[PDB]
């Protein structure tokens with residue numbers, strides 16, 4: 002019988018896998034924890050690399066669609082001196098929500114099962130899935146594309162992501178003043194102040210995404226935030242910075258706390274027939290510019306294998322080796338490199 006394929010997660014990995022499987026004539030459902038009204042809130046910017054994200058879109062028949070919608074407007078990465086506030090200068094881009102929309106727009110209406118938050122995977126008739134809403138399903142193939150805190154990973158491993166000692170505080174400037182819009186430009190502004198850093202990107206709707214990155218223990222942040230709240234704590238950490246960069250920070254309405262976790266480079270799970278992990282589920286690592294690109298490439302490796310080969314279990318097993326070998330080669334530099342951003 003043609004296999005019942007369950008994808009857990011409607012991120013870039015899960016949607017990329019579902020689209021390649023659908024186009025290969027496979028029966029695929031994606032189970033997404035979030036309700037449909039959740040895309041269109043995410044608008045951070047990213048670029049798809051010619052050897053990963055763009056390969057995945059080509060495999061899914063969407064490379065030209067991506068090229069039609071991408072910005073090719075020569076977005077430059079700028080550097081800011083935290084103390085002088087001086088800015089210097091030294092790749093097809095798409096907002097995160099527009100990437101997810103592109104994949105959703107290419108899929109049949111029924112593909113994604115919204116409000117299906119996986120709570121258990123129970124293996125051998127194949128694999129049982131239980132959802133927080135009480136729904137039960139049975140699948141022959143389960144692709145874990147369920148992100149940093151993958152429930153599918155929790156079925157295969159007791160190993161958890163570890164804190165990096167860095168937390169990003171994410172803010173938005175919906176209508177930047179002329180001065181801060183001109184300072185950031187059309188692209189990115191990166192400011193490394195040691196244990197404080199500031200990462201700003203303009204998205205396709207001329208909104209600024211702000212990451213206030215703090216090297217602080219979770220315990221210290223808990224105490225300070227409990228007392229002062231997020232906004233006061235975040236702004237308080239940059240009082241030694243140039244006035245121009247502090248104004249950029251103070252223009253943010255709210256901040257969300259985004260602890261930066263990573264799986265360890267030595268991460269392993271015992272392979273299980275008919276179950277695998279892709280993207281952040283398989284190899285969550287600090288945000289050094291690989292995550293969406295790897296997620297989509299992983300999805301395309303696994304989905305192509307399931308389309309090309311009649312032995313589904315063996316196809317998945319071979320694709321998993323490639324996913325894991327590729328990620329293990331990148332994770333040490335990602336983990337150590339990220340730490341070196343915050344050295345003093």
Ligand SMILES: Cc1cc2nc3c(=O)[nH]c(=O)nc-3n(C[C@H](O)[C@H](O)[C@H](O)COP(=O)(O)OP(=O)(O)OC[C@H]3O[C@@H](n4cnc5c(N)ncnc54)[C@H](O)[C@@H]3O)c2cc1C
Nearest residue numbers: 010012013014034118119147148152280281288292293296
């Ligand atoms: C602050 C920050 C900045 C980043 N910047 C960049 C960047 O500039 N460039 C870049 O390439 N990457 C960046 N990343 C990394 C990137 O966001 C991720 O690597 C990428 O989104 C992973 O895709 P995915 O499909 O594996 O997982 P996700 O995109 O996390 O998708 C997982 C999906 O699974 C769903 N889900 C979770 N648990 C369940 C469950 N139990 N049942 C059902 N559904 C579930 C979630 O709702 C979600 O839709 C950044 C990350 C952070 C934290």
Ligand SMILES: [Cl-]
Nearest residue numbers: 289290291292
């Ligand atoms: Cl990343």
